[PDB]
Design a binder for this molecule. Structure first.
Ligand code: XF8
Ligand code: XF8
Lengths: 299, 300
């Protein structure tokens, strides 16, 4: 199994750069609006403790330089929504795809198009961790890069990049400007909380192993959801939700293995270890492939 | 941070089309007024067992080829064969044609794959050309004709077109001149790859990446000569390291202050002792599909 990103072209066609003064971030151009992190309006001195409302009231449309490549896109309106700035522009992006803005849950995966000065550099798959960070790859200049999924022809934007934490993980907002996790857009010391293992994705991985004929770990027993969740937390595994049980349904139907029976197998693995064996050629249990990712790569 | 990262695929997406001959549908690459695709699109299931492609192709007419770019059929007005690739001349140029070239990559080099089904892009990921000339891709039925590429400035360098999956689950294909990487043939007959080796220069690059991201338990105070390292490498079915490789690792050596031969001494220790149940950059195995250039680009 490979981490596989969505093809990035539909998002590449929406990337722009936004400059205030000497500060250039990436923005997302959809119809006649450009979305970007509001900290583009901050000086280094503002960043230490910014008053965004005051900073913005002193800004005018003509202070914002929006460019697609080197072609300026004139700004005709501006507003702030949580931690994102929305700049109305006088040109509708002819490459706008069908799109929506979604807020994802921990454990869900998405593709990141890393961009610098509006120019795409690379694309990779990420999982939202339970502590609301992503293990991304981002350098200075990447703020405003977005994460997304593509369903049929519709791009669901779910992430806009803002922050790199001391442990080298990343934090950001949805496209309505609300941070995932407790983070704030201020240049003050912050840290990722203790992370946990994404149980629903580990289960998806076990289902993937079964689909490929690797099934030594299946046992004759079952468990209740509550008993499993209480045990899982003692191994720093996330508890399951009803939604997790639901999204495992297709894999459960494909293999004939009830979700709670697979939970009982995973519990035995947690309690007893791998005893030197591998699953899908790995001694480690993978937790960044969702049930959707598994069906998309097996079938 | 450090991720396996593919090139943005947009420039290639705008070239993907669907090609159907008989009951076989796969992908084609539409550049200017030519569509490139695997020649086995012309085979029936019976032909595939032992195809005489020149004989099979002369019996085909332009109208036997259905090319579709989205909702639009493209009229085939000419066809020819170059090794294992079929070239369909069509009556309209692709306005989305990027600046491009066709290159043949060397083992150990990386490239991005745009996996496509029925002419539609489905996913993108990074692969390396293995020393045994396979690639460890993720390809299903319908993926034939998907391509691999690198991007340099605004120029797309196409290096791979997908043809086959071997019994071990690894993959095989051609350059865009239709010549296979490796000893493989486009016939439906069981085929095995030669023994593979690990791409040593890439393992070292990835160890340098691990240091840049603060993961350095595997370092040691020792050093080694290049030849003594290579003796151990070959014993463990790792490729030998050349002085060109040492030079290419230079910037990573400069960035970290770890001499290349010192990192070789660390890798020697890992080969001889294993990882003692530890991990590097989250992996329990030594990763060899990041080139030095891949690492520098990401960690600059
Ligand atoms: C983003 O602002 C950006 O790319 N701006 C472009 C250059 C003008 C950067 C992206 C970061 C920089 C390095 N890698 C990245 O992904 N974002 C920021 O610099 C953050 C801006 C805030 C949100 C207003 N600031 C930031 O991430 O600082 C981290 C701290 C201070 C919150 S936590 C920390 C403390 C000590 C050491 C490391 C991290
Ligand atoms: C390609 O032809 C394609 O996608 N065609 C579309 C569906 C009409 C496929 C791609 C393969 C299919 C499964 N995963 C893939 O990457 N290519 C082929 O089917 C090969 C066609 C040849 C080149 C004429 N055939 C093939 O890959 O078979 C493998 C063997 C027979 C060479 S080796 C083998 C033997 C036993 C078990 C597994 C593999």
């Amino acid at each position: 199994f490979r981490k596989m990103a969505f093809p990035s072209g539909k998002v590449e066609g929406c990337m722009v750069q936004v400059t205030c003064g000497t500060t250039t971030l990436n923005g997302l151009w959809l119809d006649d609006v450009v979305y970007c992190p509001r900290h583009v309006i901050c000086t280094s001195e503002d960043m230490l403790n910014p008053n965004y409302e005051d900073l913005l009231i002193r800004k005018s449309n003509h202070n914002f330089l929006v460019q697609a490549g080197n072609v300026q896109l004139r700004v005709i309106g501006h507003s702030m929504q949580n931690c994102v700035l929305k700049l109305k522009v006088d040109t509708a992006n002819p490459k706008t795809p069908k799109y929506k803005f979604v807020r994802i849950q921990p454990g869900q995966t998405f593709s990141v198009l890393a961009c610098y000065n509006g120019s795409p550099s690379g694309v990779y798959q990420c999982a939202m961790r339970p502590n609301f960070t992503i293990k991304g790859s981002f350098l200075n200049g990447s703020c405003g890069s977005v994460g997304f999924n593509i369903d049929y022809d519709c791009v669901s934007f779910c992430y806009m990049h803002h922050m790199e934490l001391p442990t080298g993980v990343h934090a950001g907002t949805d496209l309505e400007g609300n941070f995932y996790g407790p983070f704030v857009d201020r240049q003050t010391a912050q840290a990722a909380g203790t992370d946990t293992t994404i149980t629903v994705n580990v289960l998806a991985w076990l289902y993937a192993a079964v689909i490929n004929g690797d099934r030594w770990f299946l046992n004759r027993f079952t468990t209740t959801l509550n008993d499993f969740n209480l045990v899982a937390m003692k191994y720093n595994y996330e508890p399951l939700t009803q939604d997790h049980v639901d999204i495992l349904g297709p894999l459960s139907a494909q293999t004939g293995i009830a979700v709670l029976d697979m939970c009982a197998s995973l519990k035995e693995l947690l309690q007893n270890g791998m005893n030197g064996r591998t699953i899908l050629g790995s001694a480690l249990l993978e937790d960044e492939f969702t049930p959707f990712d598994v069906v998309r790569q097996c079938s």
